[PDB]
Symmetry: C2
Subunit: 73 residues, 2 copies
């Protein structure tokens, strides 16, 4: 997992203003686990309009399928 | 940490319908919450869960994902 591409792809996602507290570590299984705090734009409900896009991108681009994404304004 | 008491308090929170993928390790907590679909959980649920986990369990390193 290239942490720079992960950061770039998070900030490249429509409706993402910023992020912090990105953690990416290996589970016992050796599979990637990710947590992140995302500040979404005021115009989008991120549950509907950002979360599915971040899930899709993290799976497709990084093979990360164990995700917990929190949104703040 | 009593996961049974964490479970009760999460489910006791207004706007919470269910949760899964609760993980607590050295304390850090992650969880997936299904909110009531009539509630945007970003203002009506998230701060409430964060203050409850702080008050009741001394847990402040939290990541809560709302979905479904
Ligand atoms: Ni945060
Ligand atoms: Ni889930």
């Amino acid at each position: 997992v290239d942490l720079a591409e992960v950061e770039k792809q998070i900030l490249a996602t429509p409706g993402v203003k910023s992020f912090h507290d990105l953690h990416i570590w290996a589970l016992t299984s050796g599979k990637a686990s990710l947590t992140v705090h995302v500040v979404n734009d005021t115009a989008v409900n991120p549950e509907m309009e950002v979360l599915p896009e971040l899930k899709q991108m993290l799976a497709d681009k990084f093979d990360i399928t164990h995700v917990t994404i929190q949104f703040e304004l």
